[PDB]
Design a protein around this ligand. Structure first.
Ligand SMILES: CCCCNc1ncc(-c2ccccn2)c(N[C@H]2CC[C@H](O)CC2)n1
Ligand SMILES: [Cl-]
Ligand SMILES: [Cl-]
Ligand SMILES: [Cl-]
Ligand SMILES: [Cl-]
Ligand SMILES: [Mg+2]
Length: 243
């Protein structure tokens, strides 16, 4: 209840994208200090506080004409949008400049730092992917939105933090390939058999051997054999310093 906001401080606009239970609308939130803030409205998070984890600005429950409730979650606006679509733009003219290797690692580290936070609070993401990572105006990444080619083999139906590491591994692959779909040539219904027979995501063309080892360690068959987010973050931070 301490999260709720009076709708009269909210103005909706265009549609930014399509979400799970409905569409996401841009909007203006009139802040306490009287100013107006650009926000995103989707049409457990308030306890989260971390720069690489999406913050919740509040919630609105607009009543309809018939009285059926229309809940709305107020989130920050990020002009650079989801990270998946950003990777695709970068390899085109007009879009963002060619993303260097170092910057790509900074994305991975940010995500790693964000998952380290949620994993310390023993919170499972259950849907980590490059599409669910947003780029702030300072080009830092934050996790949000908490599908077969991202799910861990053991979960194909048990889920732990080590499954988030699996998804994190795939996300690293998405980033290193600048927006490729996982498992080219393989179809969704073949994934369990494909993984069960020991096959994993192949190494990208220009990717570093020591960067592939890190993301490969995310797909070890035994979840307990996989590294924690704290180990992963430091490995990426150290690989980044060696450039
Ligand atoms: C995780 C979503 C938080 C909302 N913030 C935001 N800000 C700007 C854009 C944005 C920025 C540029 C262009 C379009 N949308 C955006 N797109 C959504 C991303 C997720 C998707 O499921 C729905 C749309 N979200
Ligand atoms: Cl409105
Ligand atoms: Cl945020
Ligand atoms: Cl962009
Ligand atoms: Cl592959
Ligand atoms: Mg999403």
């Amino acid at each position: 209840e301490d999260v709720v906001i009076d709708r009269n401080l909210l103005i909706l606009g265009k549609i930014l994208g399509e979400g799970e239970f409905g569409s996401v609308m841009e909007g203006n939130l009139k802040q306490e200090d009287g100013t107006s803030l650009k926000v995103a409205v989707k049409t457990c998070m308030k306890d989260f506080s971390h720069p690489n984890v999406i913050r919740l600005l509040g919630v609105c429950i607009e009543m309809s004409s018939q009285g059926i409730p229309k809940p709305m979650v107020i989130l920050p606006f990020m002009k650079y949008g989801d990270l998946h679509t950003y990777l695709l733009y970068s390899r085109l003219e007009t879009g963002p400049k060619h993303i260097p290797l170092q910057t790509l690692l900074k994305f991975m580290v940010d995500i790693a730092l964000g998952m380290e936070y949620l994993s310390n609070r023993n919170f499972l993401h259950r849907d980590l992917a490059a599409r669910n990572c947003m780029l702030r105006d300072d080009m830092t990444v934050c996790v949000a939105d908490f599908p077969v080619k991202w799910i861990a083999i053991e979960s194909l139906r048990v889920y732990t933090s080590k499954s988030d590491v699996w998804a994190f591994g795939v996300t690293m692959w998405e980033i290193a390939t600048r927006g490729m779909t996982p498992y080219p040539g393989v179809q969704n219904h073949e994934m369990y058999d494909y993984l069960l027979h020991g096959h994993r995501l192949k190494q990208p063309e220009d990717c570093l051997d020591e960067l592939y080892e890190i993301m490969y360690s995310c797909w070890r068959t035994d979840p307990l054999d996989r590294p924690t987010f704290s180990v992963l973050r430091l490995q990426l931070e150290k690989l980044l310093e060696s450039l």
